[PDB]
């Protein structure tokens, strides 16, 4: 019973906010990531890395503020405050994009802390660690999109910037440059997120509409007790309803709730894999057979060829302002445009 | 269009003409759909986390539940005690009816708005 | 001819599409919001050129 | 020498078969377009 | 259309090999019962 066990005792005390050993990593990193974002979106510009205003101080609103990525010229520099680029100058560090790596790196370690927290509390309370396991999906998304993806590209500049409209820009970039909607790993992600949301709604509605009458009030919430042994709704009536409405139904409560874990987690894992591919420009951009036919046959047109015309417009029209370090000068005569527009 | 690439065509053109990404009802739709996926995974992981031991390690735990059995197959108070400490106590449900109503309402209301 | 400009879009598998690129194409912009059932067309061939199946479905 | 005691039967119920065949057929439907390219 | 020729055998084994695995396991389960 030395200092270590005494410290263990204090860290694991049942208090309003559980701390634990994981809290030592989690609480500083989460708070700094969050405070970095709020500090940057309130006060910090993107003029020198992006040519953009991005803070409330400059006139932006909640949709257009952002902590933007560092300039492309920074490469994948860690951009430490004390590093060779900022050289300890806080002001210059902000102007060069240091808050972006600050938030991304402290966010990464905060995510680790939170998942360690899930393990720590699950072990102390005595339950299985499936909530921790499920949280692997948000982690894979964060690391593949914010870290692996720019690491395969020229610099952090092309990672997502932390902002509402800046993420919207990131969506449209991926359509125009990667044709990301055509990627089957994204499509599996879509099916997992929409399938998750479907499962969420249909399970909640089913329970609420197969409730047992356990009280006399018109508000049915009061007729449940968290220590009651009995199921609060009829699995048997739910199963018959869905069997006759949809053809199949769940019959196993354990399988149902595992499946609810399984679907959205697996979807997010799949999209992460596709973004790893996009780190290398290993896109699912084209269908070779379509391009061969269309090149030789000017009357052949599909929704596939129509969408590429849209991507080509996106690229030419946003690249000069979106990649200012390339100094793209596109004279009006080279811009792709349909008739009149 | 009734097709996969046609859907994406519809989306891209919609954004050019309506800036739907910058429309709050679509933003509420994303929160309904992101949050629905989140709460799906949360609820599934919390129930799965607190299944009562009913099987050996050589069998699927799923056989611990029999269709139409009268007792619950997991321990909601253990689930509440885990999740209330993961956040704090009053951010965790211990009424199953309230919880399942929340599960239904969040993605339904989000998708109404995006509709 | 979804956009009514006599520029037909190929939507079906047998006309050079795959599962990802194929579609039932919306009805002609020349029709607008007019109702276009089969019996309003001079022939099925007309009804298919103008995107009649989309409306039926 | 005794026969190995660690051997165990393996099971796949009919519902799992249905779920697995649907997964494989839908995966095939999704990826085939890219295999043909 | 000029599609990848190996696409056909790739698709067929992609379907056939995991499906046959599942069928084997199911049928031998039924005959235990």
């Amino acid at each position: 019973r030395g200092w270590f066990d005494i410290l263990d005792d204090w860290l694991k005390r049942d208090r309003f906010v559980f701390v634990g050993w994981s809290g030592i990593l989690l609480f500083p990193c989460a708070y700094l990531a969050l405070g970095g974002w709020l500090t940057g979106t309130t006060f910090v510009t993107s003029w020198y890395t992006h040519g953009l205003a991005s803070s409330y101080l400059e006139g932006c609103n909640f949709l257009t503020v952002a902590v933007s990525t560092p300039a492309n010229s920074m490469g994948h520099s860690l951009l430490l405050l004390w590093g060779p680029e900022a050289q300890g100058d806080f002001t210059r560090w902000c102007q060069l994009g240091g808050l972006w790596t600050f938030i991304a790196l402290h966010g990464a370690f905060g995510l680790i802390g939170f998942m360690l927290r899930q393990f720590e509390i699950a072990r102390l309370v005595g339950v299985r660690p499936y909530n921790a396991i499920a949280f692997s999906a948000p982690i894979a998304v964060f690391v593949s999109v914010f870290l692996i993806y720019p690491l395969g590209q020229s610099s952090w500049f092309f990672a997502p910037s932390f902002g509402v409209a800046a993420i919207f820009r990131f969506l449209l970039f991926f359509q125009g440059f990667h044709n990301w909607t055509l990627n089957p790993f994204h499509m599996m992600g879509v099916a997992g997120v929409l399938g998750g949301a479907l499962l969420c709604a249909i399970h909640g509605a089913t329970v609420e509409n197969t409730l047992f009458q356990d009280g006399e009030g018109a508000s049915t919430f009061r007729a449940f007790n968290p220590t009651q042994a009995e199921e609060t709704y009829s699995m048997v009536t739910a199963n018959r309803f869905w069997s006759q409405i949809f053809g199949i139904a769940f019959s196993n409560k354990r399988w149902l709730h595992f499946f609810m874990l399984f679907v959205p987690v697996t979807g997010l894992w799949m999209s992460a894999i596709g973004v790893v591919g996009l780190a290398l420009n290993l896109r699912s951009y084209d269908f070779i057979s379509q391009e061969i036919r269309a090149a030789e046959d000017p009357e052949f047109e599909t929704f596939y060829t129509k969408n590429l015309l849209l991507n080509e417009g996106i690229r030419a029209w946003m690249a000069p302002q979106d990649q200012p370090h390339e100094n793209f000068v596109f004279p009006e005569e080279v811009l792709p445009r349909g008739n009149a527009l | 269009p009734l097709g996969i690439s046609g859907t994406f065509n519809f989306m891209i053109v919609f954004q050019a003409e309506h800036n739907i990404l910058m429309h709050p009802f679509h933003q509420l739709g994303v929160a309904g759909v992101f949050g629905g996926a989140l709460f799906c995974a949360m609820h599934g992981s919390l129930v799965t986390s607190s299944l009562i031991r009913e099987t050996t390690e050589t069998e699927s735990a799923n056989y611990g539940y029999k269709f139409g059995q009268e007792e619950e197959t997991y321990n909601i108070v253990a689930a509440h005690g885990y999740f209330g400490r993961l956040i704090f106590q009053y951010a965790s449900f211990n009424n199953s009816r309230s919880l399942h109503f929340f599960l239904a309402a969040w993605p339904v209301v989000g998708v109404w708005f995006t509709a | 001819d979804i956009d009514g400009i006599r520029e037909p879009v190929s939507g079906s598998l047998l006309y050079g599409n795959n599962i990802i690129t194929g579609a039932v194409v919306p009805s002609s912009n020349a029709i607008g919001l007019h109702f276009y059932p089969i019996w309003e067309a001079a022939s099925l061939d007309e009804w298919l050129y103008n995107g009649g199946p989309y409306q039926l479905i | 020498m005794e026969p190995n005691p660690n051997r165990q039967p393996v099971e796949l119920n009919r519902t799992s078969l249905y779920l697995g065949l649907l997964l494989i057929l839908v995966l095939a439907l999704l990826f085939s377009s890219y295999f043909f390219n | 259309m000029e599609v990848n020729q190996l696409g056909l055998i790739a698709t067929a084994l992609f379907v056939l090999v995991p499906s046959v695995f599942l069928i084997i396991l199911y049928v031998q389960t039924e005959s235990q019962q």
Binding site: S243, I248 | - | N18 | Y18, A28, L29, F36 | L8, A12
Partner: peptide, 30 residues
């Protein structure tokens, strides 16, 4: 050959629906 392949897979899924619905493991209570 690719048209034949896409329609074949689709037809298999429809047949699977038939068996999954009408030849399911019947849920038996308790």
């Amino acid at each position: 050959m690719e048209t034949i392949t896409y329609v074949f897979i689709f037809a298999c899924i429809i047949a699977l629906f038939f068996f999954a619905i009408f030849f399911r493991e019947p849920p038996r209570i308790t």
